[PDB]
Design a protein around this ligand. Structure first.
Ligand SMILES: Cc1cc2nc3c(=O)[nH]c(=O)nc-3n(C[C@H](O)[C@H](O)[C@H](O)COP(=O)(O)OP(=O)(O)OC[C@H]3O[C@@H](n4cnc5c(N)ncnc54)[C@H](O)[C@@H]3O)c2cc1C
Ligand SMILES: Cc1cc2nc3c(=O)[nH]c(=O)nc-3n(C[C@H](O)[C@H](O)[C@H](O)COP(=O)(O)OP(=O)(O)OC[C@H]3O[C@@H](n4cnc5c(N)ncnc54)[C@H](O)[C@@H]3O)c2cc1C
Lengths: 463, 463
């Protein structure tokens, strides 16, 4: 029951799923004069994901790296509607999306109708065009105990989960004798995954222990050991070998224990079982005690996207995401497009890709608005002469803790970077500041870093 | 069982109850070379209470107005111990204090012993001298339903309670038709008490509705009605009539409904029953619908202090607090002192009084340290010639919303203030900044106000 469907104004109804890099980047550029835009997301704010590993330890505050959706939609003059809910089903034949857990509906620049909805009432939202940018969810690879005892580093609530857990562990630990193995275990941290997220989590967590906890509890800070576990033989494989080696070397210098070629077989309450392949080809088993476990590895398709694979013939054999065109149209559909991590275009699952794909698609949409026929669609694209999406790889950045970073800025073939250590850290900061999507978030993080210089981090367990 | 008692170092063991204005002001001045100090508080941070009414709505962040105890104790070179727990009983004859809900123990500048305590283990802490600064708790006057449906504005968690409640109400409201009385009720707020806390809560809440909520949901913001209920015939009675009148007039200008001479008889889930005495002497009953109820009125003695009234003969008939001397010694005890809201010295329950009392007492303590006899105590004070505590009333400040405040700065007989509106607001800011107890908190609030100028408030319901 319940079908929300506005059809008086002579503009196509465009429906966006998500409020992340794809959805919000698309929202910033879509022509709200030519189109009526509706967003569906259970998260009422944009998350600047590259600074999330700084949240738990309080190098940056949570509020500093998030921006409410409404602020973005307010800069758009035309009509925008936001449904604070999550899409549970996409319905191609009906051209509707079923929602669930409706918390609120905000209708900006719309002094008009009342939809007649109640909180947590199921509803279908009609669309003329659909943009899917729901993202991916963390992948445990079916390794037992990951979700039971481990914390992902995916969203803002995960930042609070980790702080509470580690804070509780530090308190419990400090009441025990120095020899006690339980004290050593509770002070131990394990981060799984050697990508930017894992490495930066480990580095920020190490920055806290050395720079803050050491000042008032040096006996504890000394006993804290951070571990970083990676299945491949190299950390940060998207960088050059020279930079990976420096990244690894540097982490080791700050007393982070790097387990390369090590895969977690199972996670228990107080330890994880890890297998390690050695140079010669032999496999050995380890046990790594831990008090806090951070899981920052693979991506998996969401149920909403998985369910949609079955409803479209040519998506039936998809796995990692929606198989998409060079025009970012979902294969088999006439009016659904997919950008970011939820779409498979043979590109990396990065914000950089989601951003470009969004800009590309938004520019295609105002081009559609001028052509009479868009007032079957696959053929119109190639017939009306406009370009396939071409990803330009701008490179990669990464913070390694202790005021050192690695960077590679490029464009096309030409590489032109400065990727040492302390200088790259200052670059890493300025560059991250410049690609924040709002002035508020930009000023907030800026103030966070200035405060850090003088007073070094807030670590409140209940806040 | 379990008695913590350090007795090798030749210094008196001074035990402080609380981590508020009294306890921390006393901690800042106590001579840690002449004394060993231990603090017991369930709150591990100092709260700058005058800015608490700015927390819920996000004019200031919660973290900006709190400062960890350890930071204060770190500036003291001598030994300081903090028990994260609450005192459940004071034992005069044993000279110990029973504690409960022990979360942690931190021993600063003490590379020494292990106390052998577990979390939530009952324990008695021995003392040579005791300083009680536990404060008062909010008084409902036994009016039914206050605690069931109302929110106090006393501590940091109360700030989050109010934001969550109002946020939920705004969401529920916006899904209803404009005529609907439920929409009008959910958008209605009632603040009980016309003191600085109540008035400032109302004003800050009104600043949010006009300045922020109006920008993206003007239909909602228009329907929001804030009520301020006061039992006396005047708002802010500590000020001159001229300033109260301007305070009242101004609140009314910003569309706050001021119910003077109105007392709440009972609080129900969706409304409160209020009685109003009129000019001629007649009493009428009202019903005030509400969605959010903030209760900012009287103070009551804590159970810990109430229980102690029975254990000391001369405290048997006490009610509002511990009956104290001119030397701030608890009458009937030889080694217990009381400062702030938990002690009754015939002075107002204010931070200003707690601060002065603390400084006075701390200065008495290093004076005791030089006199051999303190290596029965009532008589030593008057015999050794030092002064009774004399409260100097520096006056009163208050924010009224919409960038207006009222102030009265004085000292002794001489009054010399500037208490108009917009100018007084700038004074009100600078003065509040100057009496914040730490540089960090000072810089944080400073940055909060700068950000407010450009981007106007964060109102995240889950953060
Ligand atoms: C800690 C961390 C650090 C990172 N650092 C970098 C970096 O430095 N550089 C880089 O290029 N990439 C980085 N990434 C990757 C980047 O975050 C993703 O590639 C990017 O967010 C993908 O954009 P998206 O819009 O596809 O998904 P997201 O940006 O994650 O947005 C997905 C949105 O969908 C919403 N949603 C979820 N389920 C539903 C539903 N059922 N209905 C409606 N909405 C839903 C979510 O609330 C969210 O708003 C990082 C990721 C993490 C976790
Ligand atoms: C919202 C608000 C705004 C205010 N604004 C002003 C203002 O502008 N000007 C002004 O002069 N006054 C103001 N006050 C009043 C002022 O804050 C109090 O009078 C002052 O805090 C009294 O200090 P205290 O040390 O007596 O207790 P508090 O400052 O209340 O501190 C009490 C401490 O004791 C701890 N505690 C409680 N129970 C126990 C226990 N059983 N064992 C151990 N510890 C315990 C608490 O955790 C806390 O750390 C305001 C109060 C509030 C609530």
């Amino acid at each position: 029951m319940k079908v929300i469907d506005p059809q008086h104004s002579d503009k196509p109804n465009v429906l966006i799923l998500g409020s992340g890099w794809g959805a919000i980047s698309f929202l910033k550029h879509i022509d709200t004069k030519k189109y009526n835009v509706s967003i569906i997301s259970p998260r009422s704010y944009f998350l600047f994901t590259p600074l999330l590993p700084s949240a738990p330890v309080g190098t940056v505050d949570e509020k500093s790296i998030i921006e409410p959706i409404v602020n973005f939609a307010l800069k758009k003059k035309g009509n925008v509607t936001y449904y604070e809910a999550e899409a549970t089903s996409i319905n191609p034949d009906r051209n509707t999306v079923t929602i669930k857990s409706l918390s609120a509906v905000s209708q900006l620049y719309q002094p008009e109708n009342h939809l007649g909805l109640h909180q947590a009432e199921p509803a279908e939202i009609k669309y003329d065009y659909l943009i899917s940018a729901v993202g991916a969810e963390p992948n445990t690879f079916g390794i037992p105990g990951v979700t039971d005892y481990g914390h992902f580093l995916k969203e803002i609530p995960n930042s609070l989960e980790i702080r509470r857990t580690f804070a509780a562990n530090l308190e419990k630990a400090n009441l025990l004798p120095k020899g006690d193995p339980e004290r050593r275990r509770l002070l131990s941290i394990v981060v799984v995954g050697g990508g930017p997220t894992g490495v930066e989590a480990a580095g920020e967590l190490q920055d806290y222990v050395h720079q803050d906890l050491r000042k008032f509890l040096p006996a504890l800070a000394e006993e804290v050991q951070i571990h970083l576990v990676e299945a491949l033989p190299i950390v940060l494989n998207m960088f050059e070998k020279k930079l990976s080696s420096y990244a690894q070397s540097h982490l080791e210098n700050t007393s982070i224990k790097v387990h390369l070629r090590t895969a977690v077989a199972k996670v228990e309450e107080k330890q994880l079982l890890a297998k390690t392949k050695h140079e010669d080809g032999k496999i050995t088993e380890e046990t790594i005690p831990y008090g806090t476990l951070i899981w920052a590895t693979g991506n998996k398709a969401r149920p909403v996207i998985t369910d949609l694979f079955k409803k479209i013939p040519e998506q039936n054999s998809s796995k990692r995401g929606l198989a998409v065109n060079d025009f970012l149209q979902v294969k088999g559909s006439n009016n659904i497009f997919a950008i970011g991590d939820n779409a498979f275009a043979g590109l990396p699952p990065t914000a950089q890709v989601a951003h470009q794909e969004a800009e590309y698609l938004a520019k295609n949409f105002d081009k559609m608005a001028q052509i009479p026929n868009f007032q079957k669609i696959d053929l119109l694209f190639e017939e009306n002469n406009f370009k396939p999406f071409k990803y330009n790889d701008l490179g990669a950045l990464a913070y390694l803790g202790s005021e050192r970073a690695i960077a590679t800025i490029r464009s096309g073939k030409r590489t032109f970077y400065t990727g040492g250590g302390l200088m790259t850290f200052y670059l890493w900061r300025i560059l991250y500041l410049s690609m924040i999507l709002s002035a508020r978030s930009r000023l907030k993080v800026f103030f966070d870093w200035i405060k850090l210089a003088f007073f070094k981090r807030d670590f409140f367990k209940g806040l």
